[PDB]
Amino acid sequence: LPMPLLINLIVSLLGFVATVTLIPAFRGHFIAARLCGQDLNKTSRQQIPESQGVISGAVFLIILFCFIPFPFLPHHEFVALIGALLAICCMIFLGFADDVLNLRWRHKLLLPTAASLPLLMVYFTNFGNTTIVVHLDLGILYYVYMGLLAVFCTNAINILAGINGLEAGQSLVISASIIVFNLVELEGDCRDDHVFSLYFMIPFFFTTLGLLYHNWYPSRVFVGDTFCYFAGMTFAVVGILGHFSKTMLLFFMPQVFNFLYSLPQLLHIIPCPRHRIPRLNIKTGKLEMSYSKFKTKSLSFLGTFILKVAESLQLVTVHQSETEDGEFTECNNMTLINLLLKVLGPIHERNLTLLLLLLQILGSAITFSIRYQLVRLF
Amino acid sequence: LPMPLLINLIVSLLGFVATVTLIPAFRGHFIAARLCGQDLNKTSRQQIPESQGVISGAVFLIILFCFIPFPFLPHHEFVALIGALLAICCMIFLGFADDVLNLRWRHKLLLPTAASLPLLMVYFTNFGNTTIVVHLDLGILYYVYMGLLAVFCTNAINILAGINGLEAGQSLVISASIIVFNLVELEGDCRDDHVFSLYFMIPFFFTTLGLLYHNWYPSRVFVGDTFCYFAGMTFAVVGILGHFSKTMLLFFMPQVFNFLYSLPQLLHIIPCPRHRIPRLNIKTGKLEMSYSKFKTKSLSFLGTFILKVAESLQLVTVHQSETEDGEFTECNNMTLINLLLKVLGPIHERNLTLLLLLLQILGSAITFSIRYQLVRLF
């Protein structure tokens, strides 16, 4: 176990160097490829290369392809290693294809379930435990869970974005938490399930680190949806094949909140604008809250209920107004980023991200305290 | 053996239908993505979607992902099935990324060797025969062969192009030849190596058929380099893991000629222009030969030798001229397409491709006649 992990750490560090180096090397290619855009929360109108998650994702694959013989230098764990690499590779591919082509939201949800198929087949051939603990055999519903886990993690990361270094940053906190957890649980009982998880988590961390080097404020590159697809599948891969998917979903606490808080807007029960990202006040330099103003008559009975319950829960800022066109309701954009600006006022982009990363650390500490009996201590 | 092959044929036919249907469905996406271009050998200036090999390649992957449990419903042949799918998937990905980004020719040659790594690792873990028959153990040089085989097949297909339905068409003749060969050799001796090859060749044939449906004259879509990368790796995958790589390289006869005949121009020993494709005479409707005119003084001593030897072999048409700038030499563009126009005069695009496809059939018949003792018959 320490001998292949040493080799895995060496290739991961070479991969960090590789990502840091290749990202600015391909800058010209992405700009020429029209795979670039402006940073909307910035006064600068310069084009920044998009989908850089494709370069770190590619570096990740090559690193692991080289690593493949070392754990071996038994097949049951080897099939899962090649199978997991197929599922991740397919996802980086279909992820980048979705970035380049901008597929319909319905086709976007099918892509993660498509890429997760080899894991389901490996779990089938290697006779994986279809039973779950509250002792219940899910059988077919367990395979539906595995399929949907890839779809969840990607979109959970993808919905909690809009400020520089958030998507890559939250993934670093999550992967580092899994790394810490794997090491703690490596000492005894489940050694095989946590050594396997480390094999993917260490290269994922260091390639993402190299990406964050360029994505961090002030954003030099964008990660793109390719990164969210890549990250989401890597987390689903380790959680599924490591059997710690429940523990792993607890590291997704800020994402789960942000998702449910967003849900009334996403389902269009409460009016949703094109972009729910904060509005930068040029004179301040900091980011202010964004709003979704709409006609009160056009709002549904269910929507009027949810918006009144969320206002009474002290989560949404509601501003009533009346114009020549009629009466309009200015509802606060429902996302964790805008909720932090409601609670703490206007915050600068670099501090706002860092704060959400700290919030991600807090949740991980909460998970760890539950799992290891540290509630009495703290 | 017939039971999983039946299921493989069913999914392959559904895949044909899928490719035929999805290609025109995504037309809008590619045009908007600026992933489109004009057909240079045509008077029509309309933009035709590029890289459609990504859609057939994707359909291929999904088909095989569904197929994975059926041969099983033993691991040694399963590892190669998942391993081969990883190598092919990685290639479709890095292939499409190269289409979208247009990487340097030196990085383009590293991509196939990168994607072929899982096959090398599977061949390593599953203790593959490093020995070869003229009885010689190549050891390390055998792994270099496997790595370079992917690079060869892709580029061999990629260099023999320039007319509608050639790249997809030549791949259909090659894959159909391998299908026929697998079936002949399935009856006895090596059943496992040919049943494995069929598992990939049948889905490759029917997805390419669906692509050719739209690529065939008059080209509605372009296959892109994504297809050449995809095709090349699938042929290298089956040849390597099926151990019939020598027999398979004989089906690549028109490609091997076209490559070597092109070599003096590619290496720039003899001047090479931007495009060595035929020139369409608007009044004729047919395609005429293309030429590479250059200064005789700028031509190397080795280049003057090769061009004189190729002229004496009755392969290249050389036209000497003298202008105000000085004396210039108008050399014929060295490719199998232009050589066919030198021998048979101007030919229409639809007939020219069909003729090269027939030429590909001839070579396959030659290979089959050698392998099965049919020289006396014909």
Short mmCIF file of C-alpha atoms in Angstrom, two decimals, chain B residues 176-345:
data_model
loop_
_atom_site.label_atom_id
_atom_site.label_comp_id
_atom_site.label_asym_id
_atom_site.label_seq_id
_atom_site.Cartn_x
_atom_site.Cartn_y
_atom_site.Cartn_z
CA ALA B 176 -15.95 -5.41 -43.80
CA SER B 177 -12.73 -7.29 -44.85
CA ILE B 178 -11.84 -7.84 -41.11
CA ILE B 179 -15.51 -8.95 -40.47
CA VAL B 180 -15.27 -11.51 -43.40
CA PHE B 181 -11.77 -12.67 -42.21
CA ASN B 182 -12.98 -13.04 -38.55
CA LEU B 183 -15.95 -15.21 -39.67
CA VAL B 184 -13.73 -17.46 -41.87
CA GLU B 185 -11.22 -17.93 -38.95
CA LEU B 186 -14.04 -18.28 -36.32
CA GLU B 187 -14.84 -21.93 -37.38
CA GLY B 188 -11.63 -23.26 -35.76
CA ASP B 189 -8.21 -22.66 -34.11
CA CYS B 190 -8.43 -18.95 -32.99
CA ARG B 191 -12.11 -18.49 -32.08
CA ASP B 192 -11.53 -16.17 -29.05
CA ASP B 193 -9.31 -13.67 -30.98
CA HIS B 194 -11.86 -13.38 -33.87
CA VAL B 195 -15.06 -13.28 -31.70
CA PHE B 196 -13.44 -10.36 -29.79
CA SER B 197 -12.59 -8.57 -33.08
CA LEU B 198 -16.21 -9.00 -34.32
CA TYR B 199 -17.55 -7.36 -31.07
CA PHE B 200 -15.90 -4.07 -32.18
CA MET B 201 -15.94 -4.42 -36.03
CA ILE B 202 -19.76 -5.01 -36.44
CA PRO B 203 -20.69 -1.79 -34.39
CA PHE B 204 -17.88 0.14 -36.19
CA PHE B 205 -19.25 -0.91 -39.62
CA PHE B 206 -22.90 0.03 -38.98
CA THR B 207 -22.09 3.41 -37.27
CA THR B 208 -19.75 4.29 -40.21
CA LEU B 209 -22.54 3.21 -42.61
CA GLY B 210 -24.87 5.78 -40.96
CA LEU B 211 -22.12 8.41 -41.28
CA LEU B 212 -21.43 7.54 -44.97
CA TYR B 213 -25.22 7.95 -45.50
CA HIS B 214 -24.66 11.70 -44.94
CA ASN B 215 -20.95 11.95 -46.11
CA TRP B 216 -21.46 10.22 -49.53
CA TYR B 217 -21.57 12.41 -52.72
CA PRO B 218 -23.01 15.05 -52.51
CA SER B 219 -21.45 15.43 -49.00
CA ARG B 220 -24.06 16.71 -46.51
CA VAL B 221 -21.60 16.44 -43.56
CA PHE B 222 -17.84 16.07 -43.12
CA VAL B 223 -16.35 13.24 -41.02
CA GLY B 224 -13.43 15.35 -39.66
CA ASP B 225 -10.08 14.11 -38.26
CA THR B 226 -12.16 12.78 -35.26
CA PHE B 227 -13.33 9.94 -37.55
CA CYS B 228 -9.75 9.09 -38.77
CA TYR B 229 -8.54 8.99 -35.14
CA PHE B 230 -11.56 6.85 -34.13
CA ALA B 231 -11.23 4.42 -37.14
CA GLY B 232 -7.45 4.11 -36.81
CA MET B 233 -7.63 3.19 -33.08
CA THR B 234 -10.51 0.68 -33.61
CA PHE B 235 -8.44 -1.11 -36.33
CA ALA B 236 -5.30 -1.01 -34.16
CA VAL B 237 -7.39 -2.25 -31.12
CA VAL B 238 -8.76 -5.35 -32.97
CA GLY B 239 -5.47 -6.13 -34.76
CA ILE B 240 -3.41 -5.94 -31.49
CA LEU B 241 -5.82 -7.82 -29.18
CA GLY B 242 -6.80 -10.26 -32.00
CA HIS B 243 -3.12 -10.91 -32.93
CA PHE B 244 -3.90 -10.54 -36.71
CA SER B 245 -2.15 -7.14 -37.03
CA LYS B 246 0.02 -8.44 -39.96
CA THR B 247 -3.06 -9.69 -41.95
CA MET B 248 -4.89 -6.45 -41.03
CA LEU B 249 -1.99 -4.25 -42.34
CA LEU B 250 -2.38 -5.99 -45.75
CA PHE B 251 -5.93 -4.59 -45.96
CA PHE B 252 -4.09 -1.15 -45.75
CA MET B 253 -2.33 -1.65 -49.18
CA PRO B 254 -3.79 1.47 -51.05
CA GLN B 255 -3.01 3.57 -47.88
CA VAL B 256 0.62 2.27 -47.66
CA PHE B 257 1.18 3.17 -51.38
CA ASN B 258 -0.48 6.60 -51.07
CA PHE B 259 1.72 7.29 -47.98
CA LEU B 260 5.11 6.40 -49.58
CA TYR B 261 4.17 8.13 -52.89
CA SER B 262 3.32 11.25 -50.75
CA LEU B 263 6.50 10.97 -48.55
CA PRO B 264 8.87 13.15 -50.77
CA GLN B 265 6.29 16.01 -50.61
CA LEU B 266 5.39 15.48 -46.88
CA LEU B 267 9.12 15.56 -45.87
CA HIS B 268 9.46 18.67 -48.18
CA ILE B 269 12.26 17.00 -50.25
CA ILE B 270 10.02 17.92 -53.26
CA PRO B 271 7.95 21.18 -52.81
CA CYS B 272 4.54 20.61 -51.17
CA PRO B 273 1.60 23.10 -51.52
CA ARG B 274 -1.14 23.74 -48.87
CA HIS B 275 -3.72 21.41 -50.55
CA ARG B 276 -2.80 18.48 -52.83
CA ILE B 277 -6.51 17.77 -53.69
CA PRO B 278 -7.69 17.75 -57.39
CA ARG B 279 -8.88 20.98 -59.09
CA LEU B 280 -12.54 20.93 -60.32
CA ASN B 281 -12.98 22.29 -63.89
CA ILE B 282 -16.31 24.22 -63.66
CA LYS B 283 -17.03 23.72 -67.44
CA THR B 284 -16.26 19.93 -67.29
CA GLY B 285 -17.88 19.07 -63.93
CA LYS B 286 -15.11 16.45 -63.40
CA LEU B 287 -11.89 16.68 -61.27
CA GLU B 288 -8.52 17.44 -62.94
CA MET B 289 -4.93 16.92 -61.63
CA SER B 290 -3.31 19.41 -59.22
CA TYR B 291 0.30 20.66 -59.57
CA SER B 292 3.13 22.04 -57.36
CA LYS B 293 5.18 24.65 -59.34
CA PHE B 294 8.48 25.81 -57.74
CA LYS B 295 11.94 27.31 -58.50
CA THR B 296 14.42 24.70 -59.89
CA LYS B 297 17.41 26.36 -58.06
CA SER B 298 15.63 26.10 -54.64
CA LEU B 299 15.12 22.30 -55.18
CA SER B 300 17.59 20.01 -53.29
CA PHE B 301 20.00 17.47 -54.95
CA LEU B 302 18.01 14.58 -53.31
CA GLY B 303 14.71 16.16 -54.48
CA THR B 304 15.96 16.47 -58.11
CA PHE B 305 16.94 12.76 -57.97
CA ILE B 306 13.58 11.45 -56.52
CA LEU B 307 11.53 13.59 -59.01
CA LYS B 308 13.64 12.23 -61.96
CA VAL B 309 13.33 8.58 -60.74
CA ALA B 310 9.52 8.97 -60.20
CA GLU B 311 9.22 10.50 -63.75
CA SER B 312 11.24 7.58 -65.26
CA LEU B 313 8.97 5.12 -63.33
CA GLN B 314 5.98 6.83 -65.16
CA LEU B 315 4.36 8.07 -61.89
CA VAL B 316 4.89 11.88 -61.91
CA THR B 317 4.13 14.38 -64.75
CA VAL B 318 6.93 17.02 -64.89
CA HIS B 319 6.45 20.29 -66.87
CA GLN B 320 9.49 22.57 -67.41
CA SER B 321 8.97 26.35 -67.97
CA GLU B 322 10.89 29.69 -67.99
CA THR B 323 9.53 33.12 -66.91
CA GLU B 324 10.89 36.67 -66.17
CA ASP B 325 11.53 35.56 -62.53
CA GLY B 326 13.58 32.60 -63.87
CA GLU B 327 13.15 28.87 -64.62
CA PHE B 328 10.38 27.00 -62.71
CA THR B 329 9.42 23.27 -62.55
CA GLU B 330 5.70 22.27 -62.44
CA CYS B 331 5.65 18.88 -60.65
CA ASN B 332 2.48 16.71 -60.34
CA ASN B 333 0.97 16.45 -56.79
CA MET B 334 2.07 13.06 -55.42
CA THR B 335 -1.03 11.21 -54.10
CA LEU B 336 -3.07 8.14 -55.24
CA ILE B 337 -6.06 10.43 -56.19
CA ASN B 338 -3.90 12.57 -58.59
CA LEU B 339 -2.12 9.41 -59.93
CA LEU B 340 -5.57 7.99 -60.91
CA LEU B 341 -6.29 11.22 -62.83
CA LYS B 342 -2.84 10.92 -64.55
CA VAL B 343 -3.71 7.35 -65.68
CA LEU B 344 -7.49 7.68 -66.35
CA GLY B 345 -7.77 11.44 -67.16
#
